[PDB]
Amino acid sequence: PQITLWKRPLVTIKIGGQLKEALLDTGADDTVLEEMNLPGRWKPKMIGGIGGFIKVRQYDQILIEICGHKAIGTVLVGPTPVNIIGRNLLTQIGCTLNF
Amino acid sequence: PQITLWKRPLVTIKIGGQLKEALLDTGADDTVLEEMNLPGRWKPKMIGGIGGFIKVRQYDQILIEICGHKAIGTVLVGPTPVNIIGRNLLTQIGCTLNF
Numbered sequence: 256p257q258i259t260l261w262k263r264p265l266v267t268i269k270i271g272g273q274l275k276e277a278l279l280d281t282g283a284d285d286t287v288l289e290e291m292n293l294p295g296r297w298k299p300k301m302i303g304g305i306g307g308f309i310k311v312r313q314y315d316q317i318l319i320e321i322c323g324h325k326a327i328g329t330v331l332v333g334p335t336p337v338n339i340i341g342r343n344l345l346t347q348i349g350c351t352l353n354f
Numbered sequence: 355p356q357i358t359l360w361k362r363p364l365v366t367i368k369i370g371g372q373l374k375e376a377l378l379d380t381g382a383d384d385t386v387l388e389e390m391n392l393p394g395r396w397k398p399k400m401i402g403g404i405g406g407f408i409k410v411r412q413y414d415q416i417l418i419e420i421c422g423h424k425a426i427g428t429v430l431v432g433p434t435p436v437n438i439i440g441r442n443l444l445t446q447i448g449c450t451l452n453f
């Protein structure tokens with residue numbers, strides 16, 4: 256589909272058996288989700304944004320369904336205020352900016 | 355044009371007569387540029403992203419050309435790590451997400 260930018264581009268995602276709302280963010284290198292208890296191993300990471308850095312847990316080869324489009328990649332989990340879908344997964348669903 | 359997301363969607367912008375590189379950022383409500391001298395009046399403001407808040411100077415009704423498309427809107431200037439073009443200007447140049 257096509258998503259205008261009058262409002263935040265929030266869509267429904269499915270991860271780890273749960274439905275969530277997430278922001279399609281062309282300005283995010285990585286996908287960063289609000290605190291959730293995913294199974295398996297992880298590695299610590301620090302990611303920077305406007306204002307500074309936050310600590311997150313890096314999970315690899317995680318499946319996420321974004322508006323029915325599946326993507327498999329790295330998912331970071333930590334104290335983010337909004338679920339963010341980043342370019343690592345947006346590329347996999349064929350997402351483009353168009354003007 | 356159509357922009358894929360395998361790389362950061364960086365474009366050349368012109369503001370205050372000066373060229374700069376900036377990030378097309380669907381995850382930003384607002385446009386935030388690195389410290390620079392802009393003509394006209396400004397008001398102090400604060401904006402919060404990942405990591406915390408930063409102090410910015412808000413310039414309203416500023417001419418800015420983004421990848422050949424002209425916009426006139428609010429620009430925030432402050433210690434941002436990257437020049438980011440947010441949805442307030444992305445809507446003016448007719449930008450949408452598509453997948």
Ligand SMILES: COC(=O)NC1(C(=O)N[C@@H](Cc2ccccc2)[C@@H](O)C[C@H](Cc2ccccc2)NC(=O)O[C@H]2CO[C@H]3OCC[C@H]32)CCCC1
Pocket residue numbers: 280281282283284285287302303304305336337339377379380381382383384385386401402403404435436438440
């Ligand atoms: C390298 O990849 C990343 O940096 N990605 C992260 C990231 O911060 N990216 C930035 C762009 C960015 C920032 C700094 C350096 C390079 C690129 C935005 O794309 C996403 C945030 C999300 C957010 C919404 C609400 C509240 C807090 C946070 N938007 C944001 O700060 O916007 C500002 C400006 O407008 C305002 O609206 C929203 C808040 C205001 C870092 C980790 C994950 C995301």
